[PDB]
DNA sequence: CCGG
DNA sequence: CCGG
DNA sequence: CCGG
DNA sequence: CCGG
DNA sequence: CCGG
DNA sequence: CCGG
DNA sequence: CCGG
DNA sequence: CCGG
DNA sequence: CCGG
DNA sequence: CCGG
């Protein structure tokens, strides 16, 4: 029942990258530093110009999969090691952003995937979910057909969600970068040609 | 497509009671007392507490099936017996609430399942709805595997809907021992372990 | 699973007619006239009276399809003609209303579909969908088993969207006839029988 | 043999309109009016802004086919009828653009389509060649596989060619409204991101 | 995939003659006498007459084959007979003109057809390639279907290449009778025919 | 179709190497430097003598693969790690050389595959295509069969392309060795030799 | 020789 | 003749 | 009654 | 009970 | 790693 | 690693 | 690594 | 045209 | 009409 | 229409 199938479909992939920095601390008891994270298709896109507001020009949208990525920045050679836990947020209902937390509250959820420290590579591969309404916080199932789109705004673009994480403080400092890469799937092929 | 799995998936049951008095009234007519009836989960789960905020270690929920029962509280021997109506409404759209009304409103309604009184057992086995937007009032069929998930909130939860009712006002008091067991499953097992 | 299918299921048919004018221009570069369309049920379902407040004795309803149709109303012996184009729009997100714009903005949408003027008929079948969020503009696939339902409000239903025009503008006035065909389906028969 | 695959391959169409007017003569002798078609993705692609220059994030192109499509504007009414032919040109090497030939110079080519004037419809659906070398004027064959890749500039993309015309003069004015449909073969997606 | 067809093709041959004559030396010693050969179609078409440039009513053209022929004109009794090598050279870059080297450059070439001299024949069925960039002199494989056209223009057109020569001086004049056999295949039949 | 055969083919390699130096900056924002890289055949066939102009014999030649190795010089103890990303570029449209930029260019680009720095070993194995036309930037697609042949010229060798660069800035100078592997296929064996 |  |  |  |  |  |  |  |  |  |  279309099935997706040629109405203007373009499935591509978009990237961007940051650095996340865990800072140090002389507390020797093990305490863990909680962070949430937040996509939203404006980092990826920048702005066009005229008549296509976009760079690519697609009127709707749809985020299909989400791979971020630990690219460490510390040496292989650095002590004090540690644990922490990367968990999928579905609701915009993190857990309190905090320097030092005497547990790793990510490391019951079913959700988890342990992180090796400070040297290791860690991934997560899933399917994000949009915050339609924050009061309320409802979603819907990973099903590729009946999945949602979205307009493809210029400036006010909603906030997906879906990684929370918690890493494990250390003597040193562990520095990271950050890859948000982004499987997204367009329609509607609304590209404008005025003269001149 | 992933068809649930295992990932904090945990179906369960619940349920609470209530006392419903249907009052006397000196007029002769068939008349009847209509009311509505409103599922929020706040009213199942209790508050936990410390750093689990609920009693069930659980972050996501969706409402499979209700079971609603009216269990009298009349006798057998009771005369000046009737009959009423109830309804499933989906849309928080009721029929307003009224003591003495000419007329059983809910019996030609498709989802009508007829009521007798004032001394039998009656029961509605449906899948109630959520209510996302009370200016639109939408909702959608009954698909279980594309059924929404929602964050299990702690004081805010949205009020579900589902059922209203159409009782035959009578001499006597025609008092009720509703009983509304909920079918519940719930996702993300979230469990927090603090020290001490 | 359920699978409609007799619990109030009423598949019917609704119309209704306009005149859209396309006005003059001592222009004689191609120039297009843009205009929007919007699709609201209450258009054509007038109010009933008493305890049934609509004509028709329905709670919910969803849109499956609409034809929109182009009876023009000039005759075959028009000269300066030209070419227009009709596209899809199922966002809230038209493109702006203008008397004269110095291109087609709907040429190269996938959902185009090519106007012959000023004396052809053209017609547009498709599924329209309605503007739950106007900040976050979503909508679901076309797909019949899991698509939405709404309340059949009296007064305030939602407006839904689907169709953007653009006229190509000539020396002659341009009327049109325009109808509205549309292809909805209710549920829960809910009428009421007062005494009297 | 690689076979196109996945590399940034984003088949899609684009389209342009202008007039084309076929003057008046006194002389009724059969005379015709010839006029060479060029085809430039610069007049399709608008620019840009910023890192990303284009307005489709692409860097390799490669047109497929091309759709011209004569829309008259005269009316069904008119007299002093005509006819015309259409030929396929691929080597820069038109007819001298003239505005009065006493013979059809595109008639006995074989790539002739006949055009019925004033009032009919002609389409032209075939495969353009660029210019590589106007000194030497050579093109390949129509091969999809082995067809060549061409960068996708900003301001200097190269002029295919595949049109010639010659309308029959005629006593009244024989305006049309041209349509220049391209289908395009983009590659290698190259969109930018920075910051802010 | 179009597989030539019919839209112009017309498959012929052309030819030519001229003297070529290797000159006497008192020297002994074996020594050869160094000439390319260059191939231009304008030596075979001469001009036509009005609005048809040329003799053969075409557009474009290509070479599929080349003949050549040494019908020489000594005779049977000659002495002081010797050796020589023909070969093919596609990319302008013979070896350089000369009346006397004292070894045959083209007799290792993997291209080398051995000559005896003088009363022989000797003959070269070959596929020349035209000259598109002197600079950096590509040219492409022996394919039928991939094989570029050529616009066939009136006094410009460029010179294919593809044949080198090394005739073994002797005593005696060596005149020969050379033949040029052209395997041509022209295309888009755009012949015009003005009144009068 | 010939279907190479025998006619002076010789498939071989060539290699060579050179040092490429990503410097230090005191900046700890996410900086990338971007560098080109260019392929010509001169820098790898070094000049013969004589008769013999290079110092292999043969007149043609097509580049079919080749394979750049980037061998780090840093050691695995490094710290302050990073990321980066090489693409191929077959237009020699290369993104601007940059000591510091804000944003990794390349990491969309369909050919993007990434780098792990500054320890680890990165090749890529591609085609790359040479430059006929800078103003026109064409190139044909991978088909081993219809590959162009080029003419082996002894200074003037035209300048083949396909990569680009990225590599993310460190505290730490990042030393690489580079080697650029070619798979060369050459034709027409054309030795000399004089005598003495 | 003729030769797509 | 070309010839692994 | 129990009910995914 | 619901019931085309 | 995750692990009934 | 080698790679037609 | 890449990932619909 | 009618169109689930 | 749409058209890989 | 194109048409051996």
Same mark, same amino acid.
């Given at each position: %029942? &279309?099935? @997706?199938?040629?109405?203007?479909? =373009?499935?591509?992939?978009?990237?961007? !990258?940051? +650095?996340?920095?865990?800072?140090?601390?002389?507390?020797?008891?093990?305490?863990?530093?909680?962070?949430?994270?937040?996509?939203?298709?404006?980092?990826?896109?920048?702005?066009?110009?005229?008549?296509?507001?976009?760079?690519?020009?697609?009127?709707? %949208? &749809?985020? @299909?999969?989400?791979?971020?990525? =630990?690219?460490?920045?510390?040496?292989? !050679?650095? +002590?004090?090691?540690?644990?922490?836990?990367?968990?999928?947020?579905?609701?915009?209902?993190?857990?309190?952003?905090?320097?030092?937390?005497?547990?790793?509250?990510?490391?019951?959820?079913?959700?988890?995937?342990?992180?090796?420290?400070?040297?290791? %590579?860690?991934? @997560?591969?899933?399917?994000?979910?949009?915050?339609?309404?924050?009061?309320?916080?409802?979603?819907?199932?990973?099903?590729?057909?009946?999945?949602?789109?979205?307009?493809?705004?210029?400036?006010?673009?909603?906030?997906?969600?879906?990684?929370?994480?918690?890493?494990?403080?250390?003597?040193?400092?562990?520095?990271?970068?950050?890859?948000?890469?982004?499987?997204?799937?367009?329609?509607?092929?609304?590209?404008?040609?005025?003269?001149?």
């Amino acid at each position: %029942y &279309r099935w @997706r199938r040629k109405n203007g479909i =373009f499935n591509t992939r978009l990237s961007r !990258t940051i +650095g996340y920095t865990v800072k140090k601390t002389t507390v020797r008891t093990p305490s863990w530093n909680v962070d949430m994270m937040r996509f939203n298709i404006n980092d990826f896109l920048p702005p066009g110009g005229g008549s296509n507001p976009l760079t690519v020009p697609f009127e709707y %949208y &749809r985020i @299909r999969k989400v791979k971020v990525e =630990f690219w460490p920045c510390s040496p292989i !050679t650095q +002590g004090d090691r540690g644990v922490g836990s990367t968990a999928v947020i579905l609701d915009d209902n993190f857990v309190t952003k905090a320097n030092a937390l005497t547990y790793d509250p990510y490391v019951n959820y079913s959700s988890r995937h342990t992180i090796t420290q400070p040297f290791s %590579y860690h991934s @997560r591969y899933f399917t994000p979910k949009p915050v339609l309404d924050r009061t309320i916080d409802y979603f819907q199932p990973n099903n590729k057909r009946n999945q949602l789109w979205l307009r493809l705004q210029t400036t006010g673009n909603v906030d997906h969600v879906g990684l929370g994480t918690a890493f494990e403080n250390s003597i040193y400092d562990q520095d990271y970068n950050i890859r948000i890469t982004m499987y997204v799937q367009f329609r509607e092929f609304n590209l404008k040609d005025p003269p001149l």
